[PDB]
Amino acid sequence: EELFTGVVPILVELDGDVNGHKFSVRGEGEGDATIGKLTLKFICTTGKLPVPWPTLVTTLVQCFSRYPDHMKRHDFFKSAISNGDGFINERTISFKDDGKYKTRAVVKFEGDTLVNRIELKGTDFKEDGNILGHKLEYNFNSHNVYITADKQKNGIKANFTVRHNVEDGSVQLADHYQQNTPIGDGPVLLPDNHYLSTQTVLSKDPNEKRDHMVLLEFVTAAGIT
């Protein structure tokens, strides 16, 4: 196809509930799948965010990952978007010794804009833990997202552990269980085992007074040759 040949505008909408605390996040930016780069700004439209921004990074469009040419057949994300009318991204994020997030999102184009609509539910968090107690540093480490084809439902699955730096020098782990499935019936390509290498830098908009997160991200596919 040709849907990701240049810079594409992106829109992210997230509605969540963590331990009863409801909230909403709006994301605006653009992506360039050719170099595997994302640049988006996120705002909490309901006031202050009840959880640390970094815990939402993975939830807040892997179709923008850079897949080297020889791995083009393994780019399930792009394939599903152009042959299956987008895809669904479901995850269970388990924070060690704390609560967990369960997320469902639909990723598809709306006009010339790639949209990621998410519903998030957080349960069993310690009101004084690293999440609700905002004890995580404002940064984000580099991770590898291991992808494999689903064994029974024409889709993929991924597993990886995100490492959140705690302000006391410790690290808060977040195990991710990911599942993707195209929204449409059409034939989408299934990949062989491989992973996505990711780098992310978080920052602030000096002129933004609402709770927010400016984000820069580089993702590259690897594991085959």
Side-chain angles (χ1 to χ4, degrees), residues 22-140:
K22 290 182 177 46
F23 64 94
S24 303
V25 179
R26 252 74 269 185
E28 203 88 282
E30 48 187 299
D32 182 334
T34 304
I35 59 187
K37 170 178 176 182
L38 288 178
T39 55
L40 307 151
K41 185 192 179 186
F42 298 100
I43 307 296
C44 178
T45 59
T46 57
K48 176 190 183 182
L49 196 61
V51 303
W53 281 101
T55 66
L56 300 181
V57 166
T58 59
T59 306
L60 301 176
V61 291
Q62 300 177 305
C63 45
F64 283 109
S65 314
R66 169 183 165 251
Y67 270 73
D69 278 69
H70 68 290
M71 290 181 69
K72 195 187 174 185
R73 54 168 288 228
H74 305 101
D75 191 340
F76 163 95
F77 301 109
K78 289 191 181 59
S79 178
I81 277 191
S82 56
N83 298 309
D85 316 307
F87 62 80
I88 290 167
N89 175 28
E90 302 174 4
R91 289 211 190 87
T92 284
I93 294 168
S94 306
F95 300 85
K96 184 141 188 64
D97 305 324
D98 213 323
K100 59 166 192 176
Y101 293 157
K102 280 181 81 298
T103 66
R104 178 231 168 51
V106 323
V107 179
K108 70 174 193 301
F109 268 110
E110 260 162 59
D112 62 324
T113 310
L114 186 291
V115 180
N116 176 31
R117 203 115 49 204
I118 317 138
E119 173 77 1
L120 175 161
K121 281 194 59 63
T123 55
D124 300 301
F125 283 84
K126 291 177 172 56
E127 211 65 51
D128 31 55
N130 293 321
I131 292 73
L132 279 306
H134 296 278
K135 309 189 184 182
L136 304 181
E137 305 192 315
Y138 191 69
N139 43 53
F140 202 87

Side-chain angles (χ1 to χ4, degrees), residues 167-204:
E167 89 225 321
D168 69 336
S170 67
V171 43
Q172 169 70 60
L173 304 180
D175 294 330
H176 285 58
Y177 288 76
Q178 194 181 312
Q179 198 183 303
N180 299 87
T181 45
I183 295 168
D185 301 353
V188 291
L189 306 172
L190 302 187
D192 293 326
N193 310 334
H194 73 280
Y195 65 92
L196 302 180
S197 212
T198 76
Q199 268 174 306
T200 321
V201 302
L202 306 186
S203 59
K204 296 291 182 171

Side-chain angles (χ1 to χ4, degrees), residues 149-160:
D150 184 303
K151 61 173 285 193
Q152 315 164 310
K153 71 165 74 65
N154 287 334
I156 59 172
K157 289 198 180 192
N159 281 279
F160 54 106

